[PDB]
Amino acid sequence: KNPKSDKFKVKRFHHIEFWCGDATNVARRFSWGLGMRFSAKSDLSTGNMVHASYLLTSGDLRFLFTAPYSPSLSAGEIKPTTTASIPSFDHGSCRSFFSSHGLGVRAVAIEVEDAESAFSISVANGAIPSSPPIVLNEAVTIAEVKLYGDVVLRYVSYKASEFLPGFERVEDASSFPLDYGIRRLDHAVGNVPELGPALTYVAGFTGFHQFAESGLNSAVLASNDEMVLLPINEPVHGTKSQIQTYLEHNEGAGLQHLALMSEDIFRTLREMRKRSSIGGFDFMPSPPPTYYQNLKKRVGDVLSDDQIKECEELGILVDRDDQGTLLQIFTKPLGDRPTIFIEIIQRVGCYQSGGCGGFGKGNFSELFKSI
Amino acid sequence: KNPKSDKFKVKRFHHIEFWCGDATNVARRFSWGLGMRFSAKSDLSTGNMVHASYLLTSGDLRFLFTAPYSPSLSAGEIKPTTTASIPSFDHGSCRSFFSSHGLGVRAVAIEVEDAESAFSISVANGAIPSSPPIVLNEAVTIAEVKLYGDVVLRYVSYKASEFLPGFERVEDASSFPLDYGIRRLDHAVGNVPELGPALTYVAGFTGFHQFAESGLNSAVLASNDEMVLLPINEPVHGTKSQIQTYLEHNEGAGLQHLALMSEDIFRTLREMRKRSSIGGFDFMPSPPPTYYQNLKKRVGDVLSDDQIKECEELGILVDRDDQGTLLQIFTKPLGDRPTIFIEIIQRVGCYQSGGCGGFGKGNFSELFKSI
Numbered sequence: 033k034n035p036k037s038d039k040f041k042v043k044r045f046h047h048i049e050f051w052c053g054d055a056t057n058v059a060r061r062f063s064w065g066l067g068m069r070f071s072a073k074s075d076l077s078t079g080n081m082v083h084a085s086y087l088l089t090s091g092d093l094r095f096l097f098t099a100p101y102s103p104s105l106s107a108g109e110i111k112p113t114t115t116a117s118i119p120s121f122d123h124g125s126c127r128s129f130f131s132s133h134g135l136g137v138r139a140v141a142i143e144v145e146d147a148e149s150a151f152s153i154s155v156a157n158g159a160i161p162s163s164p165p166i167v168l169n170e171a172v173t174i175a176e177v178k179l180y181g182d183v184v185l186r187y188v189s190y191k192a193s194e195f196l197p198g199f200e201r202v203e204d205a206s207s208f209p210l211d212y213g214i215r216r217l218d219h220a221v222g223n224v225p226e227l228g229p230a231l232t233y234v235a236g237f238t239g240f241h242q243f244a245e246s247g248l249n250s251a252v253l254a255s256n257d258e259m260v261l262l263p264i265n266e267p268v269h270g271t272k273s274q275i276q277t278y279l280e281h282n283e284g285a286g287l288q289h290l291a292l293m294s295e296d297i298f299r300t301l302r303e304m305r306k307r308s309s310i311g312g313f314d315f316m317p318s319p320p321p322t323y324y325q326n327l328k329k330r331v332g333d334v335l336s337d338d339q340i341k342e343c344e345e346l347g348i349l350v351d352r353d354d355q356g357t358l359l360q361i362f363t364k365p366l367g368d369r370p371t372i373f374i375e376i377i378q379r380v381g382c383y384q385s386g387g388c389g390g391f392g393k394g395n396f397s398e399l400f401k402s403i
Numbered sequence: 404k405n406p407k408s409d410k411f412k413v414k415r416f417h418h419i420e421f422w423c424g425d426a427t428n429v430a431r432r433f434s435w436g437l438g439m440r441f442s443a444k445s446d447l448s449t450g451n452m453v454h455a456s457y458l459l460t461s462g463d464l465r466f467l468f469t470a471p472y473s474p475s476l477s478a479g480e481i482k483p484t485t486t487a488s489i490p491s492f493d494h495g496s497c498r499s500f501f502s503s504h505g506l507g508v509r510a511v512a513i514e515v516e517d518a519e520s521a522f523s524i525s526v527a528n529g530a531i532p533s534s535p536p537i538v539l540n541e542a543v544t545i546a547e548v549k550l551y552g553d554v555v556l557r558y559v560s561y562k563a564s565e566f567l568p569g570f571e572r573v574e575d576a577s578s579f580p581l582d583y584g585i586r587r588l589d590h591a592v593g594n595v596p597e598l599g600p601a602l603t604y605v606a607g608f609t610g611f612h613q614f615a616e617s618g619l620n621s622a623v624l625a626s627n628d629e630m631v632l633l634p635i636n637e638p639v640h641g642t643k644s645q646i647q648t649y650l651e652h653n654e655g656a657g658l659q660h661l662a663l664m665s666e667d668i669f670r671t672l673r674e675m676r677k678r679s680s681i682g683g684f685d686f687m688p689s690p691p692p693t694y695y696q697n698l699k700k701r702v703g704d705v706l707s708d709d710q711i712k713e714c715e716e717l718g719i720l721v722d723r724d725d726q727g728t729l730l731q732i733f734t735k736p737l738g739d740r741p742t743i744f745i746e747i748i749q750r751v752g753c754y755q756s757g758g759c760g761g762f763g764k765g766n767f768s769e770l771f772k773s774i
């Protein structure tokens with residue numbers, strides 16, 4: 033069942049903010065690799081003396097890339113006089129986050145009905161406050177609470193093309209319209225040392241209900257309509273687990289993978305694979321000959337032999353459950369450390385029902401099986 | 404005149420090493436933007452638990468991109484037991500360099516006859532030692548001395564496709580052969596607060612001879628054959644200077660620009676300009692209508708009206724001196740801060756004579772003039 037126990041009104045995923053060393057180069061790599069458009073900016077050219085922030089958009093998915101300038105530039109500023117466009121930004125936290133964890137997701141942003149209320153309620157139910165609700169230009173309100181490790185859950189809300197006050201639109205010869213068909217964030221997954229408490233903490237302050245060898249135990253938390261999915265993994269050892277390997281290279285808990293829905297996974301993967309070796313993203317090694325042999329018996333009704341074989345061409349993995357089918361594939365790590373990666377997905381069956389077709393639990397032993 | 408006063412035998416530029424936050428994304432941006440090939444690597448996959456280093460090559464130009472992993476990975480190592488492939492690497496210095504200056508050049512590497520001797524001699528003539536000569540796998544010897552700010556002059560020497568011991572070749576489906584025609588480093592320029600002492604210091608320890616409004620005073624230091632060019636600028640104020648603007652955003656002295664020679668500047672600029680908005684590098688605003696009108700009188704004999712107008716198409720600036728002509732164009736800053744940039748050049752007239760045609764001093768008042 034889905035209890036619908038949300039403690040405050042949640043709408044949709046709103047954006048993912050990466051904390052980087054140099055925002056410019058990462059966005060520009062991400063843009064070309066993922067087919068994402070340069071749509072907004074906040075930096076020196078827009079009067080921001082604190083941080084450089086660049087927004088990539090594709091359909092409704094928004095990726096934000098941020099880095100700190102020399103503190104010397106804003107040394108005359110105080111919070112009340114700040115030129116930062118994201119009031120929660122902190123030079124030390126960012127440099128500290130980036131030193132300890134490397135390129136990674138700092139904030140999972142969700143749009144809510146009233147972020148002020150979202151923050152209060154959440155903190156009343158045990159959330160660790162990170163940034164208090166700030167009202168920007170009397171139009172947008174943001175707040176932040178701790179999610180897991182140094183990742184924050186960011187609440188955004190609008191009085192109601194615009195990202196945020198202070199961000200300028202790139203509407204231009206500077207924003208080419210790349211688009212490899214990716215459209216929205218499906219899920220955002222965290223790696224933590226202990227699942228239970230992570231779950232109890234997060235479920236405790238949001239009201240998100242459990243949508244709930246491998247080397248992992250996982251659980252999925254979700255909003256009332258199940259359109260915000262926030263899964264969490266923990267490792268398991270002795271008889272290494274790949275979640276532990278993440279925790280060691282990441283220096284503790286963080287965001288593991290960003291599942292990005294595509295309106296056509298075949299075109300998305302043609303386009304992304306054309307660019308792997310030329311500035312884009314590499315993909316995990318393709319499953320076997322045989323794995324494409326066993327899909328013939330199990331996805332039949334979903335997929336004609338033609339649509340199948342072309343999964344074999346693009347290294348797409350398939351899985352299924354009573355509610356539907358799902359097409360997925362995984363990138364290699366996005367940066368230097370073997371930590372955060374990206375998943376490209378498309379769900380068949382089920383607006384459509386959030387979480388349609390599972391998350392590929394099936395694929396594990398059915399890749400395996402083909403070797 | 405050129406005195407030929409080198410204190411030790413110098414051969415050619417050998418490589419430029421950038422210190423980055425995340426080496427992976429910068430190399431991958433640089434590769435696509437500049438038409439440079441992924442040729443070698445040293446990282447976790449090659450057994451390097453200390454740093455991730457990725458080599459871009461184009462003709463003879465080598466760009467190296469390096470970043471630190473979590474120190475936790477090599478906590479059991481001591482210098483004698485290190486898995487670093489570049490023995491001079493230091494986790495703190497790198498993170499400290501990167502925090503203070505942001506994306507930038509850490510090392511200007513020159514190949515010498517004997518780096519051990521190069522280091523001793525230089526330190527005997529007043530160089531500030533940075534890293535002592537280390538012999539790698541009984542084949543290559545590197546040493547480092549301070550150049551200016553936190554930039555080091557790196558001496559490399561071979562017992563004699565290989566970069567260095569410990570670097571693996573990417574010879575593969577992983578190293579696509581991009582090539583927009585860039586072939587070698589022409590010059591490497593530093594911005595410092597005071598020109599005199601910088602010059603006296605550097606000229607003092609190398610023996611490099613002086614090959615020697617704007618808002619700057621500059622001087623060019625050069626090797627015996629004048630194939631290694633190491634120019635230095637200082638600012639001038641009151642009656643801001645753009646060198647001062649660099650010094651403020653960079654947090655002091657550093658490397659200003661990398662002049663990259665192309666075997667065909669028109670093809671290099673077609674290819675680079677195709678990619679500006681799609682993961683590549685942006686170029687400074689093109690000079691006027693009129694500037695292309697005045698080239699008609701002054702480059703005539705060098706360039707037919709056809710070859711000229713196509714400078715106007717690509718925003719290429721031209722300049723000249725008795726020894727020859729030179730074609731040049733400048734990128735916008737390569738990273739977040741308005742600091743380091745790249746120059747694309749091609750020299751006509753003058754093997755060819757190092758420094759043929761000047762550095763574009765002429766272009767300054769002749770851009771100006773066209774506005």
Ligand SMILES: CC(C)(C)n1nc(-c2ccc(Cl)cc2Cl)c(C(=O)c2ccc(S(C)(=O)=O)cc2Cl)c1O
Nearest residue numbers: 221246248250252263264375391392393395396399
């Ligand atoms: C339940 C949840 C939402 C957290 N979830 N669980 C997985 C998942 C499944 C299996 C393994 Cl090993 C690891 C993960 Cl993270 C998961 C995956 O997106 C997933 C599915 C399959 C595989 S693969 C390529 O077959 O082995 C890898 C991953 Cl990472 C996911 O979302």
Ligand SMILES: CC(C)(C)n1nc(-c2ccc(Cl)cc2Cl)c(C(=O)c2ccc(S(C)(=O)=O)cc2Cl)c1O
Nearest residue numbers: 592617619621623634635746762763764766767770
């Ligand atoms: C002598 C030396 C080797 C250091 N050198 N000097 C310049 C130079 C010339 C003029 C100004 Cl303003 C600044 C620099 Cl750095 C220089 C340039 O490569 C150069 C030439 C022209 C212009 S522009 C586009 O006309 O104004 C800008 C630059 Cl950055 C250069 O190498």
Ligand SMILES: [Fe+2]
Nearest residue numbers: 219291375391
């Ligand atoms: Fe997933």
Ligand SMILES: [Fe+2]
Nearest residue numbers: 590662746762
């Ligand atoms: Fe130059």
